Amino acid sequence: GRRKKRGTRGKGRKIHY
RNA sequence: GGCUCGUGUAGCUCAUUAGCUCCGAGCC
């Protein structure tokens, strides 16, 4: 919720803050 | 193009930290 909230960049590219 | 990769104080679900989109190194 209220946070970076992203995970992947749209193709399993992930986000890892 | 296209994929992987990756916080980019880049968006949506804003409670939920992952799942989709953006695009740079790489080949060219």
User: With contact defined as beta carbons under 8 Å apart, do A15 and A9 qualify?
Assistant: yes
User: With contact defined as beta carbons under 8 Å apart, do A16 and A6 qualify?
Assistant: no
Q: Report the sign of the C-alpha dihedral through residues A16, A4, A7, A9, in that order.
A: negative
CA of residue A7 to C1' of nucleotide B14, angstroms: 14
Q: Which residue has the tokens 């919720």?
A: A1
User: With contact defined as beta carbons under 8 Å apart, do A13 and A7 qualify?
Assistant: no
Name the method of structure determination. NMR
What's the Cα-to-Cα distance from A12 to each of A7, A15, rounded to whole Å? 8, 9
List residues, Cβ < 7 Å, touching strand B. Answer: A 1-17
CA of residue A2 to C1' of nucleotide B28, angstroms: 41
3-state SS string over A1-17?
CCCCCCCCCCCCCCCCC
Amino acid at site A4: K
